[PDB]
Symmetry: C2
Subunit: 327 residues, 2 copies
């Protein structure tokens, strides 16, 4: 049995294209004590990958590329897991995972499709959940603005905010995504940053200011949102995708003093800090899904070999929904 794997060959400069990865065929090993062996089925493609090439150590050169995934346990030398289980874990960009199941959890394939355990019922879902609710602390009637709003995190964030009684405004790229936000996910409004002036969009959509800004994007979008925040607003720093491929320095928010004028808070978060609360998060999210109160879209791309090419879709805005790679 062969285990195909993408390895990190070189730390990339800007956008990471080919020759950044090395496609390698190594023989399938066997798990040691405390380890499990997993047949990888669906891989999560995440903007955080660029950073992996910080809050977590980077990928070692010559190591398998880091990747969250869902897979079938073939064998287990670990009390927590048994052969036949389906697991969410750091499975890597390869056919098969062998190692310590640290922070792995079982998923039930009969209750939801596997790729869902990478979105709304996975990491991106939890990010939206804990970031919005614990850090954003939205309340009934508050104006909630979300960047990267048609994405996996933003789309779930927008909807939970809607369920909390918030007026929800999405900032997204292109007419199709902005239409999706309003007609499908139930956002109160949308701003197409690619086609309309963002400031005028915000003035239109948030005339009395913004109480909660969920930032997935950073850059000029963040800086413009800053001129419009309300007294005691919360800015959740979830990501800065517009900056991840910078050869140049990060674009700092020149309107940051709005946080002073408005006595507002800007706070960062990392989803793994909430691991102890995952079951309660996953449980409540699941009931939202079942009740039709929240919708999750996955964008599945087939074939492990397409990894380098498919990854770039996140940075070109080419993904429509949570990007998943079928192995």
């Amino acid at each position: 049995q062969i285990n195909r794997q993408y390895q990190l060959a070189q730390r990339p400069s800007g956008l990471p294209g080919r020759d950044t990865f090395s496609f390698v065929e190594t023989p399938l090993g066997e798990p040691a004590e405390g380890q499990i062996l997993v047949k990888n089925e669906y891989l999560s493609l995440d903007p955080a990958m660029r950073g992996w090439m910080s809050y977590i150590p980077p990928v070692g050169i010559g190591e398998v590329m880091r990747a969250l995934g869902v897979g079938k346990v073939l064998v287990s030398k670990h009390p927590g897991f048994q052969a036949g289980d389906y697991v969410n874990g750091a499975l890597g960009v390869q056919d098969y995972f062998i190692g310590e199941p640290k922070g792995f959890y079982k998923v039930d394939p009969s209750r939801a499709p596997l790729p869902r355990y990478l979105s709304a019922l996975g990491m991106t879902g939890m990010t939206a959940y804990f970031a919005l609710l614990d850090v954003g602390q939205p309340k009934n009637g508050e104006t909630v603005v979300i960047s990267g709003a048609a994405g996996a995190v933003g789309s779930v964030a927008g909807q939970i905010a809607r369920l909390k009684g918030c007026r929800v405004v999405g900032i997204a790229g292109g007419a199709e995504k902005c239409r999706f936000l309003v007609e499908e996910l139930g956002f109160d409004g949308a701003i197409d940053y690619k086609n309309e002036d963002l400031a005028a969009g915000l003035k239109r959509e948030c005339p009395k200011g913004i109480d909660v800004f969920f930032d997935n994007v950073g850059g000029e979008i963040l800086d413009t949102v800053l001129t419009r925040i309300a007294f005691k607003a919360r800015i959740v720093l979830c990501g800065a995708i517009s900056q991840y491929n910078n050869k140049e320095a990060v674009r700092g928010p020149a309107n940051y003093l709005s946080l002073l004028v408005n006595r507002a808070r800007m706070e960062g978060m990392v989803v793994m800090d909430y691991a102890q609360r995952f079951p309660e998060g996953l449980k409540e999210m699941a009931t939202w899904l079942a009740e039709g109160k929240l919708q999750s879209r996955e964008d599945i791309v087939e074939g492990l070999e397409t990894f380098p090419e498919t990854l770039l879709k996140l940075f070109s805005g080419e993904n429509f929904g949570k990007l998943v790679l079928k192995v």
Copy 2:
């Protein structure tokens, strides 16, 4: 009787007749006036936290003074007050945001510094927003200034390691030898990153920012897990003809799961009594020190005013009227 005033024209010294207080009003002989950096920010156009001084109107100044006549249920003749008394001999109007100060518990001018606005800013911004704990490392910008020098001393009292950033070898010496800061970084002569690397081994848990600009952006690179950055001001940016700099390292808040939060001292006006009571005991026991640089004569105003961005004020700048 005459009320000498400075009203916003660069200014204008105009003698005016002393009027008389109506209902809801008090009459106050102004004794000491607060010269604050915020005086500049008040003169701008864009929506600040409080509306600008109107063209032609008496220049805003916080001050301490004696009530001569009260037509207000909360104030009595002979009370001493703190309030927006303005750049003038006498205040007449509603005591919007005034409070009584006990002249027995402290020197009158101290009710403009540690027991006044700058002291309460340090008090509430550090403790409510920074929430420093025993053994945490607390870095203060403008640490020699009126807010920073108090914030750093309260930090010391809470059991923190306290590191100050200040201009000049003299001021840095003062923080360590006189105020009891654990370390000091001379931003004017020394590299800041190296200074911070040196003075803050375990990273930075609380940053009390009075300055913004490059200092903030450098501090961001060494904040710790779950750090708190208190935005109190951005003095290095107030005299900019062009755009505020902006922290390029702000994503440190993400990597470190840290919080950056602004505050305005008057939001805590209702809690001033407990804050002032505690601050008074610290001063009285000699645990916390307050410096005021007092210049005599209202007439010296425009000259005295030219000090707060220079760095010439040693202590809280106060004008005796």
